[PDB]
Amino acid sequence: RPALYFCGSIRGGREDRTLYERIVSRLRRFGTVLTEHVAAAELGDRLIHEQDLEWLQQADVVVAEVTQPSLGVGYELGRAVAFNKRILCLFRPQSGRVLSAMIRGAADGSRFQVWDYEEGEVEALLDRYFEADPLE
Amino acid sequence: RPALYFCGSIRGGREDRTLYERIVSRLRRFGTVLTEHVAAGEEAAGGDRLIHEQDLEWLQQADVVVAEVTQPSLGVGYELGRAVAFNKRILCLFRPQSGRVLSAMIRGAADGSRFQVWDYEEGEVEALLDRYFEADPLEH
Numbered sequence A: 001r002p003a004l005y006f007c008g009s010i011r012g013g014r015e016d017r018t019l020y021e022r023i024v025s026r027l028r029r030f031g032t033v034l035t036e037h038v039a040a041a042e043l044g045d046r047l048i049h050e051q052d053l054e055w056l057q058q059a060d061v062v063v064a065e066v067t068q069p070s071l072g073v074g075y076e077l078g079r080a081v082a083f084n085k086r087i088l089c090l091f092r093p094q095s096g097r098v099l100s101a102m103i104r105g106a107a108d109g110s111r112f113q114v115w116d117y118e119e120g121e122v123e124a125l126l127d128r129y130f131e132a133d134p135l136e
Numbered sequence B: 001r002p003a004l005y006f007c008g009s010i011r012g013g014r015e016d017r018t019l020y021e022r023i024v025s026r027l028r029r030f031g032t033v034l035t036e037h038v039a040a041g042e043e044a045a046g047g048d049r050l051i052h053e054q055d056l057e058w059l060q061q062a063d064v065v066v067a068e069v070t071q072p073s074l075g076v077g078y079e080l081g082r083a084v085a086f087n088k089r090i091l092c093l094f095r096p097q098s099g100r101v102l103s104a105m106i107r108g109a110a111d112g113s114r115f116q117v118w119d120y121e122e123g124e125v126e127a128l129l130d131r132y133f134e135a136d137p138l139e140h
């Protein structure tokens, strides 16, 4: 099965955890979600970084929920771009916040895309994304 | 003259901007600081894609990357990720008095030599930068 790497804020703040839960659940339909407890309710920094970096290199796609600002999510995206990974970022404008110019500016609109969305449609958007370019 | 890349939160929040100006001012003692914008309208800057492209050019030019990582920020984390993949000399500065616990990805990326993370209190930041470059002078 293909491998997916999901990114979402933890020490940046866990406001969106229930949404991360939904996203991870839907991503699993398309392959193994290596990071499936960015979403765990009850949540060796070197060991964490090394295991995550192993996972990131094996991933066939990186999906990041980037509404909550987070050093770790940004770092994962930076490493992912340097690995030239396929990357999808998901951002919610209804938060009132404006997304980092660095993340929106890193997008090229094909291999690295940033999609604005509202919470209710996120499963349908993931379905759309992977039907247009399947992971094999 | 050596070049320095400074990272600090902007859209992650600007509460530490006056601290960023202090850090940028002190970094000028050691070479050219390429990113004074952190301590200083986005279409006036050329739009987000051109902001990203200019910063990445500067990051590749940099002889050292210094990041104030107390305020969580996607951009700062992204710059650090790109810097690690470029194998840059990296110093991160974090203030535990903020009340925060630093990202495990940033604390855990450190190896204690080429990528270091230093906990500090705001008053001493100039003396710590002096110490850092006195022990290991900046090479271009």
Ligand SMILES: O=P(O)(O)OC[C@H]1O[C@@H](n2cnc3c(-c4ccc5ccccc5c4)ncnc32)[C@H](O)[C@@H]1O
Residues within 6 Å of the ligand: A006, A007, A008, A009, A010, A011, A012, A013, A035, A038, A043, A048, A052, A070, A071, A072, A073, A076, B102, B103, B104, B105
């Ligand atoms: O914490 P942030 O917001 O800077 O960064 C979050 C991002 O960075 C990765 N990350 C951050 N903290 C992580 C942890 C973690 C966090 C807190 C912990 C507390 C106690 C013990 C273990 C812990 C592990 N585990 C796995 N990945 C993590 C993660 O994949 C996520 O997408």
Ligand SMILES: O=P(O)(O)OC[C@H]1O[C@@H](n2cnc3c(-c4ccc5ccccc5c4)ncnc32)[C@H](O)[C@@H]1O
Residues within 6 Å of the ligand: A100, A101, A102, B006, B007, B008, B009, B010, B011, B012, B013, B035, B037, B038, B041, B042, B043, B045, B051, B055, B073, B074, B075, B076, B079
């Ligand atoms: O905005 P963040 O917190 O995700 O990321 C901040 C980091 O990412 C880089 N970065 C982020 N926004 C930047 C901008 C920029 C320029 C004009 C703007 C106008 C309005 C709002 C934001 C703007 C940002 N310029 C240059 N570098 C930027 C920067 O070097 C900094 O270290």
Ligand SMILES: [Ca+2]
Residues within 6 Å of the ligand: A133, A134, A135, A136
């Ligand atoms: Ca395919």
